[PDB]
Amino acid sequence: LSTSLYKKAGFDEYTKLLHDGIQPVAAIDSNFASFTYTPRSLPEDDTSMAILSMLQDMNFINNYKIDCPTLARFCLMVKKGYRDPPYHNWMHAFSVSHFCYLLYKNLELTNYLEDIEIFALFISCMCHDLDHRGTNNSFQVASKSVLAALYSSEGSVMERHHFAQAIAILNTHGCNIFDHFSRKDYQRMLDLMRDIILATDLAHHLRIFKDLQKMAEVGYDRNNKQHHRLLLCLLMTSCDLSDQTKGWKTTRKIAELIYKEFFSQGDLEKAMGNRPMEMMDREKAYIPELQISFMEHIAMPIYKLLQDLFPKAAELYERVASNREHWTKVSHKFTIRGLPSNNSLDFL
Amino acid sequence: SLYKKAGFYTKLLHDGIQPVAAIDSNFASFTYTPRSLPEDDTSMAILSMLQDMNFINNYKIDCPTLARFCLMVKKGYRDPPYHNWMHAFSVSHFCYLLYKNLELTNYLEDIEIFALFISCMCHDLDHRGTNNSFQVASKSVLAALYSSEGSVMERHHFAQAIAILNTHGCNIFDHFSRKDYQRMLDLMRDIILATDLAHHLRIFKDLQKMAEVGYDRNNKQHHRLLLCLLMTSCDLSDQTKGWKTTRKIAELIYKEFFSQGDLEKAMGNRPMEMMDREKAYIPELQISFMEHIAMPIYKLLQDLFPKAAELYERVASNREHWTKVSHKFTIRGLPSNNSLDFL
Numbered sequence: 001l002s003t004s005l006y007k008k009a010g011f012d013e014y015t016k017l018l019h020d021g022i023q024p025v026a027a028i029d030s031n032f033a034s035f036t037y038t039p040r041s042l043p044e045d046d047t048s049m050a051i052l053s054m055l056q057d058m059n060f061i062n063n064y065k066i067d068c069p070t071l072a073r074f075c076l077m078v079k080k081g082y083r084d085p086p087y088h089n090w091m092h093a094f095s096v097s098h099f100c101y102l103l104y105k106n107l108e109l110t111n112y113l114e115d116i117e118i119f120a121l122f123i124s125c126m127c128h129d130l131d132h133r134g135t136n137n138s139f140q141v142a143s144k145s146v147l148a149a150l151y152s153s154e155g156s157v158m159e160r161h162h163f164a165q166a167i168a169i170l171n172t173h174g175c176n177i178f179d180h181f182s183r184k185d186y187q188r189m190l191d192l193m194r195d196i197i198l199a200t201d202l203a204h205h206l207r208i209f210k211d212l213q214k215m216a217e218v219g220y221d222r223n224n225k226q227h228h229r230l231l232l233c234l235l236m237t238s239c240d241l242s243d244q245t246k247g248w249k250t251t252r253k254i255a256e257l258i259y260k261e262f263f264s265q266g267d268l269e270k271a272m273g274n275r276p277m278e279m280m281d282r283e284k285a286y287i288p289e290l291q292i293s294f295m296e297h298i299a300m301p302i303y304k305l306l307q308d309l310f311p312k313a314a315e316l317y318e319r320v321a322s323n324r325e326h327w328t329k330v331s332h333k334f335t336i337r338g339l340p341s342n343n344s345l346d347f348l
Numbered sequence: 349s350l351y352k353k354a355g356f357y358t359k360l361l362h363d364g365i366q367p368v369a370a371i372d373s374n375f376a377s378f379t380y381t382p383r384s385l386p387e388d389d390t391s392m393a394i395l396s397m398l399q400d401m402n403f404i405n406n407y408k409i410d411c412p413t414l415a416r417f418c419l420m421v422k423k424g425y426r427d428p429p430y431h432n433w434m435h436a437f438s439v440s441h442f443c444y445l446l447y448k449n450l451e452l453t454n455y456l457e458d459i460e461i462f463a464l465f466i467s468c469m470c471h472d473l474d475h476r477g478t479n480n481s482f483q484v485a486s487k488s489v490l491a492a493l494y495s496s497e498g499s500v501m502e503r504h505h506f507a508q509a510i511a512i513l514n515t516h517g518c519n520i521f522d523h524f525s526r527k528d529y530q531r532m533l534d535l536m537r538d539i540i541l542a543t544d545l546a547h548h549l550r551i552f553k554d555l556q557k558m559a560e561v562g563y564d565r566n567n568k569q570h571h572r573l574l575l576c577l578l579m580t581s582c583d584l585s586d587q588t589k590g591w592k593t594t595r596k597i598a599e600l601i602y603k604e605f606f607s608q609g610d611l612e613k614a615m616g617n618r619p620m621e622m623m624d625r626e627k628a629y630i631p632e633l634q635i636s637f638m639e640h641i642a643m644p645i646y647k648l649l650q651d652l653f654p655k656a657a658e659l660y661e662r663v664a665s666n667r668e669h670w671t672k673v674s675h676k677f678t679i680r681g682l683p684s685n686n687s688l689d690f691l
């Protein structure tokens with residue numbers, strides 16, 4: 001049960017960060033702007049600089065006149081804002097943010113969304129799981145947590161907390177990256193971040209799914225305000241699940257992290273005298289079938305919509321479909337429930 | 349179903365801040381009927397109440413900015429039978445009565461009371477005389493913006509309030525620090541969202557629990573729950589007045605609801621009973637509303653504030669009057685002239 005203890009490094013580095021200026025994206029890696037780049041390969045100590053590099057490459061620092069020391073402090077505060085569970089940690093937020101940058105470079109998002117909307121999407125990616133406890137929304141209610149007391153009445157418990165943590169950072173002395181905005185634009189920016197972070201709740205995704213399908217059917221209209229809103233939600237879910245667009249070795253490792261996290265929650269629920277849901281129970285869970293279901297009912301339809309809207313996103317859908325096929329192959333040589341005793345999927 | 353917006357100060361600066369007894373000797377009493385005040389005197393009365401609660405001085409509110417803000421809020425309401433400016437003014441007046449009679453300063457932070465009052469003024473801004481289900485059924489721009497999030501109209505009312513604050517010369521909170529400005533807007537969001545009946549249904553179990561264990565002023569959840577309870581008591585305060593007030597407000601509420609029902613029939617949709625002039629039995633619906641919604645709110649208010657007992661007793665008395673009337677009433681909907689005087 002001690003595996004459910006995930007620490008915060010501080011409370012709710014910098015001069016060294018900007019010492020040699022912002023590194024151009026190609027100097028980080030020649031493959032940095034490619035769908036074949038695996039952001040989790042980047043040393044954790046280099047991620048803060050990579051956030052600044054992406055924002056500079058997307059021209060947001062220049063367009064929004066972002067004070068670089070304020071941006072450096074904000075980046076570091078966001079990074080410090082994640083705990084250390086197996087999956088919902090800063091490297092997850094970093095990977096999600098990188099994928100938003102990949103969509104910008106490869107899908108030519110500037111021809112579909114307003115500059116401010118893309119910038120809000122990127123910042124939302126960085127913040128979208130802030131202070132995650134390695135437990136889901138249902139656990140918050142069951143454990144009668146401070147978070148459930150605060151947000152169960154307004155829905156999407158963790159997501160509302162992630163947004164509140166983002167605002168708390170913007171309100172910390174020397175971290176307000178949106179200080180060059182007028183009161184009107186600052187308000188628009190926080191309303192965009194609120195909606196985008198809320199879009200990471202799977203229940204929200206399922207609620208707008210028919211609207212996303214209709215938008216992909218009729219075709220995206222850049223002069224349609226609802227199309228902009230729907231597209232921002234779809235893109236946020238695509239960034240959140242972007243590990244599924246990588247190579248087999250990435251998807252397998254991410255399944256190991258996800259199930260180690262889920263199973264620790266299930267074990268904690270058992271120690272509390274409760275019955276966890278099947279996928280969180282190491283004695284009931286069959287990982288290959290659970291991953292196949294997740295790929296077929298959640299991940300693949302998101303990337304199929306992405307391909308329907310953006311033909312250049314075809315390679316992403318193809319990679320997710322190929323990883324679903326890999327789980328089918330694993331299902332014919334994986335004879336255990338849960339994870340092996342060593343918590344590793346290396347035996348494959 | 350067509351309810352217009354009137355648009356897209358010097359008089360209020362000359363004598364807008366009047367002592368409250370000059371408005372009415374009974375102005376600070378639970379027996380006052382704010383709907384009796386001429387509409388043309390309501391902006392002055394809002395200023396008088398903010399001065400009487402000492403919010404203007406305490407928060408260094410700029411008076412011309414406050415006068416502009418009040419006028420903008422008043423102009424931000426349409427003219428449906430019920431959800432108009434007179435409704436927001438009467439709701440604001442009740443918040444003032446709670447401040448004057450229940451010693452709120454002993455349960456909530458000054459800023460929470462101030463946010464509650466401003467939220468009252470703004471809580472139904474730009475209301476269309478239709479509920480949240482109608483927004484979704486009509487595929488309106490409001491449903492497009494907020495239906496996936498929930499509480500369609502309440503999210504719009506809050507958006508309208510912020511749009512007024514962001515209008516030149518109307519930002520009554522401009523001088524506030526970033527943290528305080530954020531705190532105020534977050535309080536307004538939470539309080540306006542608490543006016544959705546769907547939200548009240550979801551928090552009733554917690555409200556009941558708070559009243560049972562007893563209010564704890566050091567408990568942050570208690571402050572949030574108390575604000576929701578106070579806001580709903582302000583929103584339903586017409587039920588705490590005399591029989592003539594509750595009869596007249598039922599006339600306004602149902603003229604509004606029946607118009608939505610007519611619109612739904614024209615869309616080829618089956619409206620719910622309450623909105624259907626051909627199915628609705630007003631006394632039955634009013635008794636159900638009093639028993640399930642209004643009376644439990646005022647009973648929880650009496651449990652937390654014994655000085656609020658007179659409010660619960662008045663609501664219970666009005667419910668009894670609807671039950672007696674539910675024999676002297678035989679018709680569905682409203683008569684041709686839309687009057688309930690036949691009781």
Ligand SMILES: Cc1nc2c(c(CO)nn2[C@@H](C)c2ccc(C(F)(F)F)cc2)c(=O)[nH]1
Nearest residue numbers: 200201202205237240241243244255258294
């Ligand atoms: C069963 C399962 N759940 C997963 C996986 C991953 C990694 O790609 N994330 N999640 C969860 C946390 C998740 C689901 C759904 C959204 C959405 F709402 F954005 F779509 C976000 C997050 C996975 O591999 N298996």
Ligand SMILES: Cc1nc2c(c(CO)nn2[C@@H](C)c2ccc(C(F)(F)F)cc2)c(=O)[nH]1
Nearest residue numbers: 542543544545548580583584586587601637
């Ligand atoms: C059926 C019915 N509904 C009424 C009445 C009144 C007037 O007192 N207002 N409402 C609705 C609009 C309403 C309900 C409930 C909240 C709450 F969530 F804040 F409690 C707000 C508003 C009434 O007399 N009958």
Ligand SMILES: [Mg+2]
Nearest residue numbers: 128129158200
């Ligand atoms: Mg999340």
Ligand SMILES: [Mg+2]
Nearest residue numbers: 471472543544
């Ligand atoms: Mg309302």
Ligand SMILES: [Zn+2]
Nearest residue numbers: 092128129240
């Ligand atoms: Zn995430």
Ligand SMILES: [Zn+2]
Nearest residue numbers: 435471472583
């Ligand atoms: Zn109201």
